[PDB]
Amino acid sequence: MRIILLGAPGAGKGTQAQFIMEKYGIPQISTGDMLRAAVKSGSELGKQAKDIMDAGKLVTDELVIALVKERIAQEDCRNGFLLDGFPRTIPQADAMKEAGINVDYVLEFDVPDELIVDKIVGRRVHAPSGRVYHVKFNPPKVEGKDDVTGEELTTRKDDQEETVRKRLVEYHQMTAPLIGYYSKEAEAGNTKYAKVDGTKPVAEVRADLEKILG
Ligand SMILES: [Cl-]
Ligand SMILES: [Cl-]
Numbered sequence: 001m002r003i004i005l006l007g008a009p010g011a012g013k014g015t016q017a018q019f020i021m022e023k024y025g026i027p028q029i030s031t032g033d034m035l036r037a038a039v040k041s042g043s044e045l046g047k048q049a050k051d052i053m054d055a056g057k058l059v060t061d062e063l064v065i066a067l068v069k070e071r072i073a074q075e076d077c078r079n080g081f082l083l084d085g086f087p088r089t090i091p092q093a094d095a096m097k098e099a100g101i102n103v104d105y106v107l108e109f110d111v112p113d114e115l116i117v118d119k120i121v122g123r124r125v126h127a128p129s130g131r132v133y134h135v136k137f138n139p140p141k142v143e144g145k146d147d148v149t150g151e152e153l154t155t156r157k158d159d160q161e162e163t164v165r166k167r168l169v170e171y172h173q174m175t176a177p178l179i180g181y182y183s184k185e186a187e188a189g190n191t192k193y194a195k196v197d198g199t200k201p202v203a204e205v206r207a208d209l210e211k212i213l214g
């Protein structure tokens with residue numbers, strides 16, 4: 001099975017990745033992982049990608065697509081692949097089509113913005129050790145303090161509410177046309193598309209995916 005799995009930053013689409021990998025015998029692949037790998041390999045695309053990154057420049061859609069095409073030709077994608085978080089824009093989806101990269105299912109892992117925010121801004125960390133807590137889901141033993149040292153917990157700059165909300169605003173303005181793109185592709189019979197309710201318990205989402213995919 002060839003699957004694209006999309007989802008807003010913080011929604012938790014990753015919670016279903018291992019289920020999909022084990023159901024079908026397929027690797028999880030991502031443009032981030034591809035960039036890091038091809039550089040190691042010394043292949044020509046990797047060298048081109050390394051040059052671009054070393055210059056602090058943007059990886060063009062042309063190069064990303066060539067890396068995707070190369071990645072899915074590798075032996076471990078024989079049964080399919082779980083393409084995580086890509087495409088991100090209609091131009092990238094069109095470049096997939098120009099290159100001949102169709103998939104069987106596009107899954108939109110959907111969690112309302114307010115629930116994403118509530119999840120992230122409740123996080124607490126003991127930064128010297130990377131130990132993590134959450135006011136609502138994994139609270140510490142003494143309020144606001146690290147269990148092990150007793151030092152007062154903090155929050156990551158990455159997790160500030162204004163920063164989370166800005167990231168979601170940007171995500172939806174980019175992704176809304178892409179969702180419509182794949183819905184239309186499904187209407188044409190070129191793929192299947194499903195909006196997945198990520199707010200349910202993990203075990204229920206898993207059951208729902210089993211019905212969506214078969
Ligand atoms: Cl996430
Ligand atoms: Cl990968």
Ligand SMILES: [Cl-]
Nearest residue numbers: 141146147148
């Ligand atoms: Cl303790």
Ligand SMILES: [Mg+2]
Nearest residue numbers: 027028029033
């Ligand atoms: Mg890999």
Ligand SMILES: [Mg+2]
Nearest residue numbers: 110172176179
């Ligand atoms: Mg939406």
Ligand code: NA
Nearest residue numbers: 099100101102
């Ligand atoms: Na093809």
